[PDB]
Amino acid sequence: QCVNLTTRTQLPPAYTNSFTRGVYYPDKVFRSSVLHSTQDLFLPFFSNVTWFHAIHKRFDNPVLPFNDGVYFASTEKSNIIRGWIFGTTLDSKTQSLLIVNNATNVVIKVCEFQFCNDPFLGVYYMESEFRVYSSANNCTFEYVSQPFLNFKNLREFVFKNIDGYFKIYSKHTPINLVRDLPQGFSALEPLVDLPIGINITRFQTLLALHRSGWTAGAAAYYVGYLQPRTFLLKYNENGTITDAVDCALDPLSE
Amino acid sequence: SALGKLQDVVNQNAQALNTLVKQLSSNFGAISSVLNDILSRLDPPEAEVQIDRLITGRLQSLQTYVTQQLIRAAEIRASANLAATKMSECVLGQSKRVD
Amino acid sequence: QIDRLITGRLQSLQTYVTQQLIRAAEIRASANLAATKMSECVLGQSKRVD
Amino acid sequence: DSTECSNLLLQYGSFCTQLNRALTGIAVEQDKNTQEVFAQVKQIYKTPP
Amino acid sequence: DSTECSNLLLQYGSFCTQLNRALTGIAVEQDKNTQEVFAQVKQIYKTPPIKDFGGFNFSQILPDPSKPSKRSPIEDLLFNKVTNGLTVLPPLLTDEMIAQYTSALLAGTITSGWTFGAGP
Amino acid sequence: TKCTLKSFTVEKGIYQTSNFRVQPTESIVRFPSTNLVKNKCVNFNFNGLTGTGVLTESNKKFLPFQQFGRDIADTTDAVRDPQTLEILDITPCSFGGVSVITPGTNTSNQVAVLYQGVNCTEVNVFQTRAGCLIGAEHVNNSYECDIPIGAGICASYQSIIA
Ligand SMILES: *[C@@H]1O[C@H](CO)[C@@H](O[C@@H]2O[C@H](CO)[C@@H](O)[C@H](O)[C@H]2NC(C)=O)[C@H](O)[C@H]1NC(C)=O
Ligand SMILES: *[C@@H]1O[C@H](CO)[C@@H](O[C@@H]2O[C@H](CO)[C@@H](O)[C@H](O)[C@H]2NC(C)=O)[C@H](O)[C@H]1NC(C)=O
Ligand SMILES: *[C@@H]1O[C@H](CO)[C@@H](O)[C@H](O)[C@H]1NC(C)=O
Ligand SMILES: *[C@@H]1O[C@H](CO)[C@@H](O)[C@H](O)[C@H]1NC(C)=O
Ligand SMILES: *[C@@H]1O[C@H](CO)[C@@H](O)[C@H](O)[C@H]1NC(C)=O
Ligand SMILES: *[C@@H]1O[C@H](CO)[C@@H](O)[C@H](O)[C@H]1NC(C)=O
Ligand SMILES: *[C@@H]1O[C@H](CO)[C@@H](O)[C@H](O)[C@H]1NC(C)=O
């Protein structure tokens, strides 16, 4: 089942500053009281991060490129953002990745889904609406896990695809900032490594409607793109990354 | 920065040791920098070549480290000879030499 | 072939840097002697013979 | 300017950093030598006319 | 610990012996340097218990009895202000013995002037 | 010492002659496998990570994602066991130089051995900061330095005393 959403309001997507967000642990190695220089796919400091809104009538589900990797930030309250879609053509011709977080658990499936133009979930005012794909014929990988999840909650995710391995990094942050990304530092812990082995060039954000037509809950998300670069990370005495330096940002940090 | 002269020598020696230890992580054109990985992954006819590449790279690194160690040893020996001269002429007697 | 050129040029550069370090040590010794002569012969009268 | 040569040169590690640091040490040593030899007075004296 | 690597390394000859010999020469040279600089007196001189030097105060350079290291306040400040087959050999002269040598030199130059450097 | 110096007569002094490495007594494999042996120099294989070391109980506070710990030189100094989630330090196995302290062969054939940087319990036994000294008796009297051992310790012949 697919449903076209025809009540959107036309508005260009916004842009804002990344500040010092998007740093994740590059590996599974404990390091204490050290300064470590690593060259990996990172989000540049103070970069131009694209801002999308969900407010009522804004419902931002565009087609975005994946490129080398995607940093996904979410200023979220009341649980509208539910999952992501990854693939190349997003149809039954190629094989695509599904990540969803419904009311019970987190489901990851790698199947040839015939995706809808507007994939979505729904909350009735209980969850009783799911319209993402119309079919699933060839499934190779399945993974059912625990639930991962004024704006009160900050969700950071990093999606990378190297050597057929999909690395998902996650961090949950209590915030009290009203509109934009808070300025500070928080290192993203590695969440899961999936051996999906599929080509990914395009991705989709999955939202949830509110029914009482449809109403969009107040939410905002940010999309940034990873680039191969070097960071200098500082590990404290407790093994937590507390500060970082972008090696190619300015001559002082260089 | 009063004690920079001693700290410079300490930093140089520690940096030379860190570079010499760090050079083991380099494969020098071989498939891996770990000897056990090469010995467990390849047959001895090609593992001999890979081990030879690792040996020549590490030997070049060690010879380089010994070369700068000898040069720094010569510099420290000259400084120590000067210090012994100052101990003999300034502390154990009064020196007429200006400055 | 590029590896052969790299190792040859790297050996040449290491040889050059090593001999430059030795000459730098010699020039530093000569400059220390020159500073001693500046302090003791120009800024004062020296009783040291020759 | 060969990128393949630099990619192969990265396998050898930090030899280039050591050579650059040694040359930098020699270069600052020359300035230190000149400073020790000639800058032994902090007053610029002049002869009478 | 690779036996095959050592067998291949034996084809290159006595490079390892040369490197070990050079490092050993440096290591003994450091001890010779310390002997040449600090061990220039064969008598361990000591200051008198009464510090009556005609108004001259040497408390900042003489060893402190309260400190276990028997160092001067200046020497204590100096020591506070300085911070895979590799081994570090300890120096032949420890820090307390070097401090003892400096204390002997200070006692000689305070109580005897330059006479102790040229004889009795 | 005679073989190392390539001479049948050895002068008085200390001579570096050999290298002492504590051989791995057992091999331990831990996969998600053999028993876990601690406080001994053993070979270890943790999740495909091979090495040789002594496993001791660790006071580090590894976060759940973190598995093996690296030091300044990027060597694995701590590891988490994949079956029982506990942290173990990996100290490198005891290695050191073996030096032979002897007087002249004209005087005597008695020798003492110094294991540099090696504690005496992993090898006339005397523990010095320079290492473990075997074959020389320690005396409380102080003399001039004849054969330098290190860390203020010297050796002489009068038997060999330290
Ligand atoms: C929702 O809208 C999309 C966009 O118009 C529809 O996708 C089109 O589907 C028709 C089916 O005949 C194709 O011919 C078009 O080429 C599609 N357009 C694009 C851009 O893909 C989709 O079918 C609509 N959903 C429903 C249920 O009608
Ligand atoms: C010599 O100098 C020392 C240090 O300058 C003097 O020690 C000070 O004595 C006063 C008065 O007793 C104390 O308040 C200071 O704290 C002391 N300084 C230190 C560093 O302990 C000492 O009195 C001087 N005279 C003699 C004869 O020793
Ligand atoms: C971000 O990009 C938009 C256009 O893509 C541009 O108008 C805006 O000025 C950029 N922001 C910054 C801070 O450069
Ligand atoms: C969430 O998805 C899983 C997988 O299909 C399903 O078994 C479960 O019932 C779903 N929960 C809800 C509340 O729909
Ligand atoms: C994928 O699905 C189609 C139709 O369901 C089928 O014809 C094809 O053989 C499948 N391919 C694989 C590799 O299973
Ligand atoms: C992945 O998809 C893109 C776009 O279709 C294509 O350009 C690229 O060659 C593909 N890569 C692989 C390894 O198939
Ligand atoms: C590290 O943890 C200890 C408690 O184990 C805490 O007291 C200390 O403040 C922590 N350090 C930092 C930098 O947070």
Side-chain angles (χ1 to χ4, degrees):
Chain A
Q1 291 182 335
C2 303
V3 161
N4 303 115
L5 300 181
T6 61
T7 61
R8 269 189 199 90
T9 300
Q10 285 71 240
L11 192 68
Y15 301 88
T16 180
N17 219 26
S18 172
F19 291 116
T20 60
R21 306 212 85 83
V23 171
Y24 54 92
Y25 282 82
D27 50 340
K28 305 288 182 69
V29 185
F30 184 83
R31 280 180 192 94
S32 86
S33 316
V34 72
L35 275 79
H36 189 253
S37 183
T38 187
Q39 187 272 333
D40 207 359
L41 279 74
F42 282 118
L43 178 74
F45 280 173
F46 306 108
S47 69
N48 212 13
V49 56
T50 315
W51 188 2
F52 300 94
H53 294 82
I55 196 67
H56 192 183
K57 199 133 180 194
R58 293 295 296 163
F59 194 76
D60 291 333
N61 279 0
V63 181
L64 303 171
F66 190 77
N67 290 339
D68 291 339
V70 160
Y71 163 75
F72 194 87
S74 295
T75 53
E76 187 62 41
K77 53 152 182 167
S78 64
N79 302 296
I80 294 92
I81 297 172
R82 297 292 86 201
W84 301 264
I85 303 303
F86 302 93
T88 45
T89 67
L90 302 191
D91 60 359
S92 295
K93 279 74 176 176
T94 63
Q95 192 172 4
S96 299
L97 168 64
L98 178 67
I99 304 162
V100 289
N101 179 22
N102 62 1
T104 58
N105 52 311
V106 164
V107 177
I108 294 91
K109 289 191 318 184
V110 180
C111 299
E112 296 177 317
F113 307 96
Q114 184 61 40
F115 281 116
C116 294
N117 182 77
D118 215 323
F120 74 85
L121 270 297
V123 176
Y124 289 168
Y125 290 102
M126 61 184 180
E127 182 144 282
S128 295
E129 193 169 6
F130 166 79
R131 287 187 175 94
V132 175
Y133 50 89
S134 56
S135 78
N137 60 7
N138 303 330
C139 298
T140 311
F141 181 79
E142 295 90 1
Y143 181 76
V144 161
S145 187
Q146 297 271 17
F148 294 156
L149 322 171
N150 193 3
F151 292 141
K152 277 299 205 65
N153 279 5
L154 186 151
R155 274 85 170 93
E156 291 166 284
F157 291 88
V158 160
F159 304 111
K160 299 199 298 186
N161 189 358
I162 295 91
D163 296 331
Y165 276 17
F166 201 69
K167 271 79 68 178
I168 303 187
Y169 301 81
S170 187
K171 173 55 70 172
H172 279 296
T173 299
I175 59 169
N176 207 34
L177 200 147
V178 185
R179 292 183 188 172
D180 212 0
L181 279 171
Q183 186 177 13
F185 182 75
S186 289
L188 266 71
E189 295 161 44
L191 174 62
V192 71
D193 193 1
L194 297 174
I196 64 170
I198 63 168
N199 192 0
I200 291 163
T201 54
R202 288 160 64 194
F203 85 103
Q204 294 297 109
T205 300
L206 292 183
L207 295 174
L209 299 182
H210 288 333
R211 305 262 194 171
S212 64
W214 56 272
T215 315
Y221 65 92
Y222 307 86
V223 171
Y225 286 76
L226 305 180
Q227 281 142 50
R229 56 184 59 246
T230 313
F231 283 177
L232 173 67
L233 303 173
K234 160 173 304 163
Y235 292 79
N236 66 338
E237 66 268 16
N238 292 317
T240 302
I241 298 176
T242 58
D243 211 18
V245 156
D246 189 5
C247 183
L249 171 71
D250 44 347
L252 180 56
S253 308
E254 186 153 353
Chain B
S1 59
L3 272 305
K5 297 186 66 40
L6 313 179
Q7 193 66 64
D8 189 1
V9 179
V10 170
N11 286 358
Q12 282 184 291
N13 286 310
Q15 170 201 261
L17 291 174
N18 286 340
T19 300
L20 186 71
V21 172
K22 181 66 66 68
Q23 280 296 98
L24 290 180
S25 72
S26 288
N27 47 42
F28 305 104
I31 55 158
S32 187
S33 60
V34 181
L35 277 176
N36 288 334
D37 290 11
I38 292 165
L39 285 162
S40 61
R41 277 164 58 179
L42 293 180
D43 283 337
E46 63 269 15
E48 165 157 354
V49 179
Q50 305 299 305
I51 287 164
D52 173 71
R53 297 275 282 164
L54 275 185
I55 282 175
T56 184
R58 289 164 180 192
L59 183 81
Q60 176 167 244
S61 301
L62 196 50
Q63 287 184 355
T64 295
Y65 165 75
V66 165
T67 300
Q68 281 94 16
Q69 276 299 320
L70 279 163
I71 295 163
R72 288 175 183 174
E75 175 177 6
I76 291 300
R77 182 187 58 246
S79 184
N81 287 343
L82 180 62
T85 310
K86 300 238 177 184
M87 177 87 48
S88 297
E89 293 182 32
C90 314
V91 173
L92 264 65
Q94 185 178 31
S95 186
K96 280 292 218 315
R97 295 172 61 194
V98 178
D99 301 331
Chain C
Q1 306 301 305
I2 285 164
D3 175 70
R4 296 291 299 273
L5 274 182
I6 283 175
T7 185
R9 289 166 180 190
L10 186 84
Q11 170 168 29
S12 303
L13 200 47
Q14 288 272 20
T15 294
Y16 165 76
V17 166
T18 297
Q19 61 91 31
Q20 275 299 120
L21 281 164
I22 295 162
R23 197 169 298 121
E26 169 160 37
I27 290 302
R28 181 187 59 247
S30 184
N32 286 343
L33 180 61
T36 311
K37 302 238 176 182
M38 184 65 73
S39 299
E40 290 181 32
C41 314
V42 175
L43 266 64
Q45 185 177 28
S46 185
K47 282 291 215 315
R48 297 172 61 194
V49 175
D50 301 330
Chain D
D1 55 324
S2 164
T3 184
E4 297 91 3
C5 186
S6 49
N7 287 344
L8 292 178
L9 184 54
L10 285 177
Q11 309 297 139
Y12 291 107
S14 64
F15 277 139
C16 284
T17 307
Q18 294 298 109
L19 300 163
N20 294 355
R21 183 182 295 130
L23 289 181
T24 303
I26 293 175
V28 304
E29 188 156 66
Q30 302 322 294
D31 290 328
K32 185 191 192 332
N33 285 346
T34 310
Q35 180 78 30
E36 293 294 328
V37 167
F38 291 104
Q40 295 209 5
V41 285
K42 298 289 94 177
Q43 311 281 304
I44 304 300
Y45 302 115
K46 294 187 298 290
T47 58
Chain E
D1 56 323
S2 165
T3 63
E4 298 92 2
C5 186
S6 48
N7 290 344
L8 292 176
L9 183 54
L10 286 178
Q11 310 297 140
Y12 291 105
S14 61
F15 276 135
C16 283
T17 307
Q18 267 183 335
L19 300 170
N20 295 354
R21 184 185 296 130
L23 288 181
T24 302
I26 293 175
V28 304
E29 189 157 66
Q30 301 322 294
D31 288 327
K32 186 190 191 336
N33 285 346
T34 313
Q35 292 295 111
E36 281 202 20
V37 166
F38 292 103
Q40 289 183 359
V41 284
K42 63 182 181 294
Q43 298 291 322
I44 304 301
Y45 301 110
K46 304 217 54 182
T47 59
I50 305 302
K51 304 289 185 292
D52 185 20
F53 302 115
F56 291 88
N57 194 314
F58 304 105
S59 61
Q60 303 319 106
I61 61 175
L62 283 180
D64 205 333
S66 74
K67 304 298 184 179
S69 64
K70 299 297 186 292
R71 270 193 299 267
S72 84
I74 283 168
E75 282 174 329
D76 208 291
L77 197 146
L78 288 167
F79 271 74
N80 287 129
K81 282 212 77 64
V82 175
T83 57
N84 288 319
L86 82 163
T87 61
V88 167
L89 302 172
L92 174 59
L93 289 176
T94 63
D95 299 326
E96 69 274 16
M97 311 200 304
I98 295 166
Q100 187 158 51
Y101 268 134
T102 61
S103 77
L105 292 158
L106 284 152
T109 190
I110 283 162
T111 61
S112 76
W114 58 80
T115 66
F116 81 107
Chain F
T1 315
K2 290 173 174 177
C3 192
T4 302
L5 275 76
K6 299 292 179 69
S7 181
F8 270 67
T9 58
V10 178
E11 293 179 349
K12 180 178 65 170
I14 184 169
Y15 302 92
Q16 181 66 230
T17 55
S18 185
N19 279 318
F20 170 65
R21 294 174 206 170
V22 165
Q23 288 305 307
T25 62
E26 292 85 4
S27 162
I28 304 304
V29 179
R30 286 299 280 184
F31 282 165
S33 310
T34 83
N35 220 318
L36 180 55
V37 169
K38 276 174 271 191
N39 293 316
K40 271 82 177 176
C41 174
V42 289
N43 288 305
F44 58 88
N45 198 328
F46 282 92
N47 289 12
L49 181 67
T50 50
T52 292
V54 184
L55 295 177
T56 54
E57 272 161 302
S58 180
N59 313 349
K60 281 170 181 170
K61 291 286 148 292
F62 276 40
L63 299 180
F65 44 99
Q66 278 156 341
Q67 207 63 25
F68 49 92
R70 288 196 168 110
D71 64 337
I72 304 298
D74 281 344
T75 67
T76 305
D77 61 357
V79 70
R80 169 185 285 171
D81 183 90
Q83 273 181 23
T84 61
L85 307 173
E86 55 176 14
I87 315 298
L88 305 169
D89 299 294
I90 305 176
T91 84
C93 287
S94 302
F95 62 96
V98 167
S99 296
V100 178
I101 296 103
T102 180
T105 67
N106 177 224
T107 293
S108 176
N109 47 354
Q110 298 187 262
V111 295
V113 299
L114 178 64
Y115 296 89
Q116 292 154 197
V118 168
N119 203 320
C120 282
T121 75
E122 294 75 11
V123 63
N124 274 2
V125 175
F126 181 46
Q127 178 66 60
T128 65
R129 183 64 182 268
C132 190
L133 183 56
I134 306 296
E137 52 165 308
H138 176 235
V139 294
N140 302 299
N141 199 359
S142 280
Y143 310 98
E144 290 85 5
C145 194
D146 189 21
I147 303 164
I149 310 303
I153 309 299
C154 295
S156 188
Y157 191 65
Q158 63 97 27
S159 61
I160 294 170
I161 58 162

